[PDB]
Every structure is written in structure tokens, then in C-alpha cells.
């Protein structure tokens, strides 16, 4: 029972920690990509300017 138990829960930790790293670390995407709009707005402004 110990074996099975630890196995299941550790596998839980592993899986959740995989998605955990993914979600926490990759979440930087929006800040990183702010320029996507933050400068294309100026691109369009410059046209009429």
C-alpha cells in the first residue's frame, strides 16, 4: 500500500509540476509580446501623420 500510494502521489507531483513549470515560466508571453500592439499602433498612426 505504501508503494502504490507513493507511486501515485509522486506521479501526481511530477505531472502537476510539469504543467506548473510550463504555466508559470511560459506566462511571461504577454508581457514579452506587448510590443505586438504597443508599436503597431504607432505604425498605423504614422500613416496619416
Amino acid at each position: 500500500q505504501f508503494g502504490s500510494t507513493l507511486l501515485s502521489l509522486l506521479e501526481r507531483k511530477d505531472s502537476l509540476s510539469f504543467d506548473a513549470y510550463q504555466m508559470i515560466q511560459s506566462g511571461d508571453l504577454y508581457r514579452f509580446s506587448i510590443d505586438l500592439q504597443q508599436q503597431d499602433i504607432d505604425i498605423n498612426k504614422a500613416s496619416l501623420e
Binding site: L29, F32, S33, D35, Q39, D40, D42, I43, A46, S47
Partner: protein, 49 residues
């Protein structure tokens, strides 16, 4: 005949004025592409990261 001078003068004078506003105009492409190049260069961040 004295008016012929003014007549020939004025088309050249106005064409020079045309060139003036045309050179004013073309600045758009320079700044547009400056933005394009710098933003696209930054876009490589998403890939390399």
C-alpha cells in the same frame, strides 16, 4: 511677347513646388520600415526564448 517668359517660368516653378511636397511625403516609408525592422527583430525573442 513679354508674357511668354512668365508663362514658361510658372510650370517649372510649380513643378519644383511639387517636388517639395513629394520629398516631404516619402519620409513615411523610411519611418514605417524602421518600425517594421525593429519590431520584427524583437519578434525573434519569442522563438529563441
Amino acid at each position: 511677347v513679354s508674357e511668354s517668359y512668365r508663362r514658361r517660368r510658372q510650370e517649372w516653378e510649380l513643378q519644383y513646388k511639387q517636388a517639395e511636397w513629394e520629398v516631404n511625403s516619402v519620409e513615411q516609408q523610411i519611418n514605417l520600415q524602421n518600425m517594421q525592422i525593429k519590431a520584427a527583430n524583437k519578434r525573434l525573442e519569442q522563438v529563441e526564448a
